[PDB]
Design a protein around this ligand. Structure first.
Ligand SMILES: Nc1nc(Nc2ccc(S(N)(=O)=O)cc2)nn1C(=S)Nc1c(F)cccc1F
Length: 290
């Protein structure tokens, strides 16, 4: 089965206008698109099923997890279409781009950092309450609407906890952002996302994650054997402590997403999400020059 699968007679090439590429996901390529019936903009992930082996079950899992999410903090899923050998996965388009994109004109301030982290946490609180793990939290997978709303994206490696499986142990994620227990393939749960959030916090503060100048294969020993990273530079003590709370080698010492929503860095610095429009306006003007 495949949740949201549409009638095969429906031609997505007729129902949507495919525009420019806006990314490359864990699976397939993603395009900006127009829904021809509503004229709303969508994001379209296209996957060639023929040149895909052992990736199709992964695709099905992504669409399943996506279709089971109903939250302001998770990109919406609008269904899937088949066009010959290609699968068109229709998703909510977020006009502000990724947090990583919004970093290109220059550093964020700590109000912006706190606000983005707060909204990521609302998303993680939702997922974790649903017994889901994202497993690929990073600034590239954090999207903003053009009104400044923040949502999680790319569920390509997301995991589901059950009653018959209270922990996962699969090796998945992006190396710089992966928790030591995931790399080591110990039994892990939602706390793995909390580690990834700490790395993402550093990324949002500094522009890059720890070890970013190294070959990804080095982190397979670097992360499990070294002391966890800390945020270095001229950042507030609350922000440095937020990061340390996340980046503890012991998963049970990491706070829950729910708890982190009350962390002093968040309460003291976060403001209305609408203010993030400035960050998006900043990017547009910057891109406008070049
Ligand atoms: N749902 C969704 N909307 C957008 N919008 C978007 C993307 C890029 C840009 S930009 N800054 O002009 O290149 C602007 C808006 N991207 N997007 C997705 S799924 N992004 C995405 C992602 F989040 C992870 C991997 C690949 C991807 F293409």
């Amino acid at each position: 089965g495949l949740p949201g699968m549409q009638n095969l007679k429906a031609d997505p090439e007729e129902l949507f206008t495919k525009l420019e590429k806006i990314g490359k996901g864990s699976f397939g390529e993603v395009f900006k698109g127009i829904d021809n019936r509503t004229q709303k903009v969508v994001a379209i992930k296209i996957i060639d099923l023929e040149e895909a082996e052992d990736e199709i079950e992964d695709i099905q899992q992504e669409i399943t997890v996506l279709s089971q999410c109903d939250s302001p903090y998770v990109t919406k899923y609008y269904g899937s279409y088949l066009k010959d050998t290609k699968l068109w996965i229709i998703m909510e388009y977020l006009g502000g781009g990724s947090a990583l994109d919004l970093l290109e004109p220059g550093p964020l301030d700590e109000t912006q950092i706190a606000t983005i982290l707060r909204e990521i946490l609302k998303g993680l609180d939702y997922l974790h309450s649903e017994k889901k793990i994202h497993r690929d939290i990073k600034a590239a997978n954090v999207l903003l609407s053009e009104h400044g709303e923040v949502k999680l994206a790319d569920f390509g490696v997301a995991g589901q906890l059950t009653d018959t499986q209270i922990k996962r142990n699969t090796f998945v994620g992006t190396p710089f952002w992966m928790a030591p227990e995931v790399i080591k393939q110990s039994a892990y749960d939602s706390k793995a996302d909390i580690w990834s959030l700490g790395i993402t916090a550093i990324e949002l503060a500094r522009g890059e994650p720890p070890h970013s100048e190294l070959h990804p294969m080095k982190v397979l020993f670097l992360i499990p054997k070294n002391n966890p990273p800390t945020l270095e530079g001229n950042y507030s003590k609350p922000l440095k402590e937020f990061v340390e709370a996340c980046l503890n080698k012991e998963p049970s010492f990491r706070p829950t997403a729910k708890e982190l929503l009350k962390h002093k860095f968040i309460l003291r610095n976060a403001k209305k999400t609408s203010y993030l429009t400035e960050l998006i306006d900043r990017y547009k003007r910057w891109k406008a020059e070049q």
